[PDB]
Write an enzyme that holds these catalytic residues in place. Sequence first.
Site: not given
Lengths: 1131, 48, 44, 66
Positions: A759-761, A932
């Site tokens: 999750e976007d880490s 994305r």
Amino acid sequence: DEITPDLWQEACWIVISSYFDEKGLVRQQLDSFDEFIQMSVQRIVEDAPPIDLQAPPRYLLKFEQIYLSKPTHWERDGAPSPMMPNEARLRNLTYSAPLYVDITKTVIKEGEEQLQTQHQKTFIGKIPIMLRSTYCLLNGLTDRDLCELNECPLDPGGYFIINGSEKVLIAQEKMATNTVYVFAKKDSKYAYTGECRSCLENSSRPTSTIWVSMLARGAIGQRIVATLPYIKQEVPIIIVFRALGFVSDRDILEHIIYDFEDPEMMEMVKPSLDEAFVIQEQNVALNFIGSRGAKPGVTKEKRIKYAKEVLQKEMLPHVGVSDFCETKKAYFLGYMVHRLLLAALGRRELDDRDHYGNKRLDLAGPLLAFLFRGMFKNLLKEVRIYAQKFIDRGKDFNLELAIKTRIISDGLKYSLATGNWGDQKKAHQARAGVSQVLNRLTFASTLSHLRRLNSPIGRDGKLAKPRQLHNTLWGMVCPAETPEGHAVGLVKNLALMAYISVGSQPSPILEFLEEWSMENLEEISPAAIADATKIFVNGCWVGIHKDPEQLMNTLRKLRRQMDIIVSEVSMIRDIREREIRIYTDAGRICRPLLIVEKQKLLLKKRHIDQLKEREYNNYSWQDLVASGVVEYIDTLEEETVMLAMTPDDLQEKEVAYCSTYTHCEIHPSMILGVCASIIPFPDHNQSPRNTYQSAMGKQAMGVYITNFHVRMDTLAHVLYYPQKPLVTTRSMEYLRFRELPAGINSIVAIASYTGYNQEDSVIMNRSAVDRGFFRSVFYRSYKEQESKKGFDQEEVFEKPTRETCQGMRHAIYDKLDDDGLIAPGVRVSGDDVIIGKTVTLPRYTKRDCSTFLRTSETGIVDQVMVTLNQEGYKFCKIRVRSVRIPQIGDKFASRHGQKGTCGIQYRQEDMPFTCEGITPDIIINPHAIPSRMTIGHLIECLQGKVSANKGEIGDATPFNDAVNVQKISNLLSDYGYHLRGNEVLYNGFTGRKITSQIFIGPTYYQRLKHMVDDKIHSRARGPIQILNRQPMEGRSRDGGLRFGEMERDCQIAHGAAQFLRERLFEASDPYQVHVCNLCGIMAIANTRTHTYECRGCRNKTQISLVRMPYACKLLFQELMSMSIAPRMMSV
Amino acid sequence: LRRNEQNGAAAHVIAEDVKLLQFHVATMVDNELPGLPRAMQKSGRPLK
Amino acid sequence: MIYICGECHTENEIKSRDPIRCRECGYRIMYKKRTKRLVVFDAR
Amino acid sequence: MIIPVRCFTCGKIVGNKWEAYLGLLQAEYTEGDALDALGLKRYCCRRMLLAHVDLIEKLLNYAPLE
RNA sequence: GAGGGAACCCACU
Ligand SMILES: [Zn+2]
Ligand SMILES: [Zn+2]
Ligand SMILES: [Zn+2]
């Protein structure tokens, strides 16, 4: 000889390099300020009327010639000194230059000749000076001279220093002046409306707007009316034409309808003629106009004068304001009515508000000119009052005492310091945010903030049209760089080669048109207008031409060789509408385009060869403009040009899709701005991700400026080891990103490893971080000064003593030296004194007002600077340095919108490794990619692997056919790697091969400003507000978090009533009041003496204790202040 | 207005003082009412 | 105490309430000495 | 700003190679050949020298306060 | 063992 397609890329980047060697990137700010200083200040002084004063003696004051010095400082001694920009920044001075003026005072007595007094070079204020402009002290200095003055040669200038703070003037969009725009007002009484925000050229005055509208069908017919300035009601247009001096319907229709063989225009002008038939004389029409004025005079002749003043001075000032210039005004008003009828017929399309050729950009020049016009009017007003006072009771006045320089000086200083663009007493009714504190977190943020445009449409507006990316923004405004949130679409950025026009006088073009066979409007019968071409110069209809094609050929030939017409003049031929519009005014945004004649570029190999030796031949970009090779096209002219995207569109076979190309793009990747030009492969990314990277490139920590050791900025951020990207764009060669980079090329493996990158880490290599990977320095400056706020009050920098100073904060003071200031090199913590300042109390003769370090911000005092402020008190600035090692929760972003916080840090033995022992510096999650579609991230990683193996800097210019994913894959396979960038990785914990093969390679990452240590905040109990007795605001004040309304709703839905009571009553503001059991009003309770008495009831025993929030007590007392009785009944 | 009614004063000055008192009380309660000038601090900012 | 002049690189003794001016070149921006206290850095 | 002592990824010494790399580039080497002559085989060590911006030289153009 | 408010701007999710 023609440039071959194999040499074209090299040639076009040569001419782009020449453009950025001449113009730079902040040319619009410097050019507007230079035009303001050289031309606009003197013009404002001229257009101000001379002061005529009678009691009697007559005094005529006339301001003649301004003089501007270089920026000088006067201390309390009074000796002038050349004031340097670092001195202004450090000592909190305003970098301003004194403005002198030549004044003539003539005396006219009775029975006496005129007497002349020549007050030469009279000081009337101080003009703040834009950095690196013509009148800045850094003008013309070499890089060595700038380094000897502790200035960064890469610093662009383009900003002001106001009280030591760097202020940039954001450019402001506005509707274009002197142009007729016809719209269709919806849900109104008007079917269509024509609008002309008329403003007189060669002067700084407000714009007068006239509305020539037509009433809706829902009325026997639909009629044309005119809303005039300073007129309360709408006036029928035929009455306005009669009051202009044309009583017959034939003359009015000749001014309105140019072809009398067109019956539908006659049909639509029939209702207006029918409406205004009862007035048949000019004086009756002027009476009708004056009857609806601002204040209708009782005398009819006063109404005639008022109507004449409105129709001459205030109706269309641009076509003419002098006497006997009414026929040009009548032709222009008839042209407005004709445009309204054309829109009504559907014969002409309605104008577009969002079309960007209908917009002008007020830069520093026009905005400062508006300010200086208002303040010079104020200065003349105050001089008039002073001299009136000393000619009324006295006989003479001193002129040097009459002028208040504080007006101009402090008004410019205030408007540049606050951003409120207007007056100090009218800040609520003036536009705010015109002047902003210049962003200095990155060089890219500085450039982006210096090239920033702003639509002054309110961000609370929920209509999408001004926020939309218009078609006309191509090459002018960056399509990617916009903010996120309430200001999306409204705040824009310049494209790299976009230049905003600075303004020119129409006089050479007007003279040339007068003797190039154009006949004036005054000397023609209207019957010649129907077949001829109307000619507009800055929106002024000046005449007609019978041969418009050779006229436009001649005008283009003149502009291309830099003759009579200068390069920034826009010339548009509306061929279908038979109009030629010439614009010379400021605010027109344009861009240079290569000129194409007969499917061939006028740029030949001789120009490229001459530009290859720019510093030998003295051949420059301006020589290329003078050669007739490139020319500047603005948005209105671009709507008539035919652009080839590349010269491959020219050299095309039998179906070229167009055989009439007029211009060619120099390079299409020049449509991006400063921040979007650092994105590698931007055409392989989704567009919102390019927008997010354009946002986050201004938050990336690198080296923001070279002279950061001299500067004490409040917030400063310096990376240890900034690297230039392995995968660059060519546009980055002019953003100086190779010299001041923000980021590190990182071995990034896109893999799911231990689940800590989800999750976007990102997972970071702890061993890399130990070696200085993305280590940064935070610099914080603290300013303090002694101030003599009264005779008895005296703040002083002293080392305080416990038995002498009142109200210390229980901290240590031993780290202070005996001058009251801490020394450089001393470790400090959150509860430490760095500046010891005591203020004398009028045994504790003085109390403690020492400056404390911000809490939990441990660090080391980097620098201490002591100086004098403007008013001569001791002024200390202390820079504290703290080293920020990368941490879990620190924000990191690639150049493709892939933001993310560090989730965990593994050591080198725990990270996965290739067969060569390479571990990734950063591991990102695969799931960041698919939704994305940031494929440019993958291509940058692949190209960076190729670049690091080959020993070269990869080219990621957006629209480049020489670079392809297959070519990069074959180049990578030539170096012993898998062609798609995958590698066999081994588990760090177990040594076993990972079954999947991991995409891994160098990718440019940025360390964003958002560290977790600047955001972590807890409160148990502490400071509370004075009024509502609730916890404070923010971590900086040890405040509490807001348990807002939505949280209250959520806890209602949970059913947790006791938790709701804990949060909203006894974790925020418990309070106990005593209320009367009879009246319900708060009683007077003495808890010490147990005297519970209620006035208004004579009640001393029926009092009850009620537990309520303090905010509810405050609410009830406020209601009682509003004569409401909230009576708390316990029954 | 206590002074202007304790000693003699004209009707119009008393009415003007009544108007000023009414404006001050109303702007104490409501300072955003339309049709009248806003009660402002001497710095130019309106009162709350 | 001892303040370095910003321009002329020279050290100057300044007492309290003395205006901050360099006695050599009259420069008004002056900087404190690095401390003599003993500060330990881990080499990490 | 100055060349790192270690490669970030692996920890190979690259701090003694910047002046040698600049001398090789002055001696008409290509960047890849200059990196190969210095023994930088892994591309992690090659991005240390390839992407280095030596800002300390321009910082040394300012007169020191101390 | 804790003495300002207000306005505006930038930014974050
Ligand atoms: Zn009671
Ligand atoms: Zn000195
Ligand atoms: Zn390495």
